[PDB]
Amino acid sequence: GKKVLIVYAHQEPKSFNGSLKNVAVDELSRQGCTVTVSDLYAMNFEPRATDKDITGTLSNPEVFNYGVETHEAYKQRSLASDITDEQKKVREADLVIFQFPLYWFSVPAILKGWMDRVLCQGFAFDIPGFYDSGLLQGKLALLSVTTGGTAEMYTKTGVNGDSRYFLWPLQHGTLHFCGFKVLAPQISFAPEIASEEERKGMVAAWSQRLQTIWKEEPIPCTAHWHF
Amino acid sequence: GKKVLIVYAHQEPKSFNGSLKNVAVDELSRQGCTVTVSDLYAMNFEPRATDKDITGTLSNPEVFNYGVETHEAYKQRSLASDITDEQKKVREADLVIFQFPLYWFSVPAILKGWMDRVLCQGFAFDIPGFYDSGLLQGKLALLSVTTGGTAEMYTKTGVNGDSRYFLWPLQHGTLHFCGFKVLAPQISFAPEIASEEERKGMVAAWSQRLQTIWKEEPIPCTAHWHFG
Numbered sequence: 001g002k003k004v005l006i007v008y009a010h011q012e013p014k015s016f017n018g019s020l021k022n023v024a025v026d027e028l029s030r031q032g033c034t035v036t037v038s039d040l041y042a043m044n045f046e047p048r049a050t051d052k053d054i055t056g057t058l059s060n061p062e063v064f065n066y067g068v069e070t071h072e073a074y075k076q077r078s079l080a081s082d083i084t085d086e087q088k089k090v091r092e093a094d095l096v097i098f099q100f101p102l103y104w105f106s107v108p109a110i111l112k113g114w115m116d117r118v119l120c121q122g123f124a125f126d127i128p129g130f131y132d133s134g135l136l137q138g139k140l141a142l143l144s145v146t147t148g149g150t151a152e153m154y155t156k157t158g159v160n161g162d163s164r165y166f167l168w169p170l171q172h173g174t175l176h177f178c179g180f181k182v183l184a185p186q187i188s189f190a191p192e193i194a195s196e197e198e199r200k201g202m203v204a205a206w207s208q209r210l211q212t213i214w215k216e217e218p219i220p221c222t223a224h225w226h227f
Numbered sequence: 228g229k230k231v232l233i234v235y236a237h238q239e240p241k242s243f244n245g246s247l248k249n250v251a252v253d254e255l256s257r258q259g260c261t262v263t264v265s266d267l268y269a270m271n272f273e274p275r276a277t278d279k280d281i282t283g284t285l286s287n288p289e290v291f292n293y294g295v296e297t298h299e300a301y302k303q304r305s306l307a308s309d310i311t312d313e314q315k316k317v318r319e320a321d322l323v324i325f326q327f328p329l330y331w332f333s334v335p336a337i338l339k340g341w342m343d344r345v346l347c348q349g350f351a352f353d354i355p356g357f358y359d360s361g362l363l364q365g366k367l368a369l370l371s372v373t374t375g376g377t378a379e380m381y382t383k384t385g386v387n388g389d390s391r392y393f394l395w396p397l398q399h400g401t402l403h404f405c406g407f408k409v410l411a412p413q414i415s416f417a418p419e420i421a422s423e424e425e426r427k428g429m430v431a432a433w434s435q436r437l438q439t440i441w442k443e444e445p446i447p448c449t450a451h452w453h454f455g
């Protein structure tokens with residue numbers, strides 16, 4: 001029995017991202033996996049890191065330090081309930097899939113705010129106590145990204161450089177740092193300009209890949225792999 | 228004379244980020260430059276890219292595509308007014324400085340939302356009309372970043388790898404793509420670990436660099452610069 005969390009960041013259910021999320025839900029449910037979706041836009045998830053993230057009185061209401069106040073609120077079980085709800089989902093999950101369109105070589109802001117606010121000190125890592133002494137060791141993570149640009153543009157001598165260059169902040173800087181073993185990204189290049197059949201083939205390849213997700217070897221999450 | 232926009236993303240005025248922002252304002256103001264600060268947290272700036280960003284009839288209300296709808300709305304002048312307020316500041320600026328703590332090897336989400344919502348198609352780039360043909364050509368941009376990690380950790384063979392590695396999505400993916408000439412980042416490493424003397428020297432080194440900022444050349448914003 002496995003638990004899967006899909007963190008999903010798209011405004012439109014009929015979008016190509018919506019269909020990739022629905023095909024993941026379907027296929028992992030088919031396999032008997034325990035599945036949970038965090039549909040950030042439908043939840044109107046708060047992306048801003050503010051003092052509202054700590055309930056009751058602040059540790060030092062004079063100089064506000066976000067990392068510090070959230071660390072202490074975590075330990076003392078005082079974080080806002082939107083955050084702690086996400087952390088419970090993350091704690092129980094064996095695999096976390098993030099499904100999102102690429103926005104500026106990165107995640108949409110709503111998802112960036114999820115990472116900023118949910119993966120707090122004390123939950124995802126301590127200082128020190130990161131990368132391999134990172135508190136989410138044993139969990140798998142997988143980025144499933146859709147792009148505007150074609151796969152050619154994302155070659156190391158393309159205009160955009162190699163896909164693996166933009167992955168560094170997300171795979172290594174965030175997911176590895178927290179202790180995740182990181183599975184190879186799923187990149188669905190440029191669905192808006194692919195045919196309705198190349199689009200089926202991308203959705204089907206995702207479905208097909210999810211069939212054997214649990215047999216997969218994690219990538220070596222190193223400078224060399226990305227660069 | 229010159230116009231400068233500082234896009235600032237820190238919750239706390241007494242922070243190291245707040246100090247670096249204040250010296251920027253003071254030093255550029257002293258020079259006789261025109262200065263504007265977008266203080267994202269004080270504005271409670273909206274980071275989410277939603278259908279609230281368009282006020283007109285949607286081009287395709289059956290299936291909502293944020294990129295298509297905001298491009299249309301930009302041309303029609305039906306974008307939300309918080310977006311067009313920022314675009315006006317960018318349009319008039321000669322130099323845009325981003326002042327922020329590094330969050331997950333990137334900008335805090337509120338600043339990510341500013342990039343997602345403000346730099347829309349039609350305004351910052353077109354297809355075609357990106358990288359060296361981006362619509363914001365002629366403008367300068369500069370990232371001024373503070374870290375929890377030390378300079379030691381941000382090296383080719385440190386835990387974090389070289390600091391340039393994390394700059395790629397912002398410098399090249401965003402700023403260069405929109406046509407900015409990118410100046411060399413100002414990275415202020417580990418102010419929390421640093422002593423009172425090293426912190427003060429970090430504020431003064433920024434103050435000092437700003438005196439000669441208009442004489443600097445842009446970086447070559449290429450894979451080679453970032454990665455070797």
Ligand SMILES: Cc1cc2nc3c(=O)[nH]c(=O)nc-3n(C[C@H](O)[C@H](O)[C@H](O)COP(=O)(O)OP(=O)(O)OC[C@H]3O[C@@H](n4cnc5c(N)ncnc54)[C@H](O)[C@@H]3O)c2cc1C
Pocket residue numbers: 010014015016017018019020100101102103104105106145146147148149191192196199200203290292293294342343344400
């Ligand atoms: C702020 C912003 C920043 C961006 N930054 C970048 C960037 O840095 N780099 C980059 O490359 N791109 C960028 N993009 C553009 C790009 O659109 C996104 O990266 C995104 O990946 C598009 O995916 P989508 O799900 O919205 O496609 P959609 O438009 O929703 O889907 C494409 C087509 O597939 C159809 N479809 C839906 N379901 C199915 C199905 N199951 N079978 C067949 N067809 C289906 C849809 O109806 C649609 O016609 C950016 C866009 C925005 C708005």
Ligand SMILES: Cc1cc2nc3c(=O)[nH]c(=O)nc-3n(C[C@H](O)[C@H](O)[C@H](O)COP(=O)(O)OP(=O)(O)OC[C@H]3O[C@@H](n4cnc5c(N)ncnc54)[C@H](O)[C@@H]3O)c2cc1C
Pocket residue numbers: 065066067116117173237241242243244245246327328329330331332333372373374375376377418419423426427430
């Ligand atoms: C969600 C999150 C994600 C993060 N991700 C990363 C990451 O990926 N990589 C990384 O390296 N770090 C990361 N950090 C940590 C780090 O704190 C930030 O990156 C940030 O750079 C710290 O800057 P600050 O302005 O808040 O420092 P402050 O805490 O405000 O400054 C430290 C000290 O400087 C003092 N100071 C202020 N002004 C002056 C002055 N004028 N002269 C002398 N001293 C002064 C302050 O009073 C304080 O004592 C993350 C933090 C959070 C909360």
Ligand SMILES: COC(=O)Nc1ccc2[nH]cc(CCNC(C)=O)c2c1
Pocket residue numbers: 066067068121127173177331332375376377
């Ligand atoms: C205040 O809260 C955080 O510092 N949080 C946080 C989150 C992700 C991070 N990645 C790299 C760092 C550097 C941390 N400092 C040292 C000394 O390594 C880091 C810190």
Ligand SMILES: COC(=O)Nc1ccc2[nH]cc(CCNC(C)=O)c2c1
Pocket residue numbers: 104147148149150293294295298348354404
């Ligand atoms: C309107 O919404 C966006 O498409 N916005 C946007 C923003 C930043 C981007 N960087 C690279 C691309 C893809 C461009 N190539 C294509 C379209 O083939 C892109 C698109």
Ligand SMILES: [Zn+2]
Pocket residue numbers: 171172173176177220221222223
């Ligand atoms: Zn790694």
Ligand SMILES: [Zn+2]
Pocket residue numbers: 398399400403447448449450
């Ligand atoms: Zn570049």
